[PDB]
Symmetry: D2
């Protein structure tokens, strides 16, 4: 139900081995750890969660862009990229995609049935 895909605009490649943490907003307005992983050779992170676990609510996907750029020897601006959205329930799969540059990022959601 939730996949994350990361691309690198400088190298023209998938962004490989990028740490990604997902949080869900708790009733006290704090962020509870929900799922995490590292992107694969294709820049994709699958298997984050299951249908039963992914309930409606506010999620944060935190992509560690700074570590990624430093591992490539490139100087970065942002601490990370945080993408915060509401999951709303018919049948739906979410893909959070991000395109990374050192001083800019773009993110889009691909929500399909």
């Amino acid at each position: 139900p939730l996949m994350v895909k990361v691309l690198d605009a400088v190298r023209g490649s998938p962004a490989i081995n990028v740490a990604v943490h997902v949080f869900r907003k708790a009733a006290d307005d704090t962020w509870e750890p929900f799922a995490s992983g590292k992107t694969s050779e294709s820049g994709e992170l699958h298997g984050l969660t299951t249908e039963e676990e992914f309930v409606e609510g506010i999620y944060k996907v935190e992509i560690d862009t700074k570590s990624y750029w430093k591992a490539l020897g490139i100087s970065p601006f942002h601490e990370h990229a945080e993408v915060v959205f509401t999951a709303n329930d018919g049948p739906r799969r979410y893909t959070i995609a991000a395109l990374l540059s050192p001083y800019s990022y773009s993110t889009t959601a691909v929500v399909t049935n």
Copy 2:
């Protein structure tokens, strides 16, 4: 060796049934038709060309964004999106990805071995 992927930033979906034409630059600096198709339900267009046909040179990928937006009832700015690049030969596959909004588009290249 060449794939095109198109996303819609307004609807949060793949951009389905988008016409795409690819041209290769001829010796007289004109644009020769090379391949074309329409994006699938996943927003992807595969099978454009073969290894033997896709030689080094300057290519143009013309995405008919205006037709796409009009078919969705949304008012567009651009006539189309044209993405022009040089193909250079080790082992390489090219993905041209585009993210569409009515008054903006973004494109990236994903070049892998």
Copy 3:
């Protein structure tokens, strides 16, 4: 003006007007503290957030209220906000312009950093 925020609307091809922007700074106890806030003008720009005196080193978060923007236009957006988190002034004072480009299911942001 060491910190300026500019917001554009990719649907309409226009400045994003009356967009709320909240800026936070990480405190020594590792929580986010309020730093400054404002709203974009008719040009989509937000000037006057801070001053050279107030804008010290730190980790800053600029939270752009994209959800309210789209909801006011009658549209149901995907994101809650667009957030930009960065370390500022580590090698001395700089001027930062944070720009954001908004669509209902996407946003982009960029930083332009100049040396006064």
Copy 4:
């Protein structure tokens, strides 16, 4: 200033300076004719391309020479250029700002259209 072009560099977090920009207009015989050209300033902006008199209805192409920009910085880019093609002034005169954000393997562009 009915037509302005702004270019930013996503690698350095800076204006893209000294970027060549060529503008063409489709002729009645369906070919591209030269219309105007210039280069971005130290702010990454290009003003003075055209005038209200000259900038009539038509289909325009704005070709930003991104390849030369990156090659001058010692970088081998992917794209030949970034091109923006649009119909202008169809419902009367408008002011257009074409902005582009550049990386070596990517670019984005947006249009801001205002009614004088």
